[PDB]
Amino acid sequence: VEPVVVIDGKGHLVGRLASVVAKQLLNGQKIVVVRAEELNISGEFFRNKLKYHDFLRKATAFNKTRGPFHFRAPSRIFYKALRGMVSHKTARGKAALERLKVFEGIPPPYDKKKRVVVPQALRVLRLKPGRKYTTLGKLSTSVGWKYEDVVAKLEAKRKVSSAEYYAKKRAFTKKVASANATAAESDVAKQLAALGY
């Protein structure tokens, strides 16, 4: 119900996440996916690497610049799934795709915004315990993605800053919860509780 929904893609079962995102985009919801390098694919890393190499060998024989483009970045892999599940050759599908942004890490605009998850796409909720799974960042690096390390560095920096922010917010929330704990034996609070608040 937000104008823009930011999904933290960590551990999110790329195909199921893409299905959710395709339906949202076609229904008219603006979606921004962050941390695509932390997306998960069910199955062994070797299985998914072999699948990506099968994808890689497909190319237009007489001109490789015409053939299917093999994007290595995790955001672009997720985008490939999403585009394959969106009717992208039509104007409606094109508009749906403009309604979407996918990022590795969490760039400035969205690091200070709320991140949501999709429970029907979460790996811990969907996969049976013990089932092996792949990480999109590792798969992308194995198939040629060049920016795993810089993304990791910037993510560590962002996490440090966000930890400071959350420590400040937690202190302020403790103060506010203390203030609301007082005046809870007040008459106004009693009427609110009688009304369910």
Binding site: S178, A179, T182, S186, V188, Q191, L192, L195, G196, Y197
Partner: protein
């Protein structure tokens, strides 16, 4: 010097374990595990809340942290007697979980005039709370 191992306390499927039905004719009532049929199936009894003695899928109920002493296979009369003796209903109504359920039911039951009153009272309380926060 002493070994430390995190307990990771789970609620246990066991005779006497109190469960809350989330789907079916009961849909929000408490029952007790009479016994365990399979890893996914239990025979339960809800005589105090009106839940008929029935074999139910464990996926149809939520285990509660409440347990009372009950012999395995106890019939409905015994289950009701032990339930009353252990005062399961009071123990459940004291929990924040049941308190949250009742609060959401009351909020759903509010009328438009009561929502307006809630707004007014919330503003009144917010004034004092913000004043205390600024004083702090």
């Amino acid at each position: 010097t002493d070994s430390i191992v995190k307990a990771s306390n789970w609620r246990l499927v066991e005779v006497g374990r109190v469960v809350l039905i989330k789907k079916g004719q009961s849909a929000g009532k408490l029952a007790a595990i009479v016994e365990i049929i399979d890893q996914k199936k239990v025979l339960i009894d809800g005589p105090k809340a009106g839940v008929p003695r029935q074999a139910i899928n464990l996926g149809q109920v939520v285990l509660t942290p409440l347990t009372f002493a009950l012999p395995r296979g106890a019939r409905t009369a015994t289950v009701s007697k032990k339930w009353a003796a252990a005062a399961v209903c009071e123990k459940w109504a004291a929990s924040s979980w049941a308190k949250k359920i009742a609060q959401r039911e009351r909020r759903a039951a509010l009328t438009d005039f009561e929502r307006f009153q809630v707004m007014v009272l919330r503003k009144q309380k917010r004034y004092t709370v913000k004043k205390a926060l600024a004083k702090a």
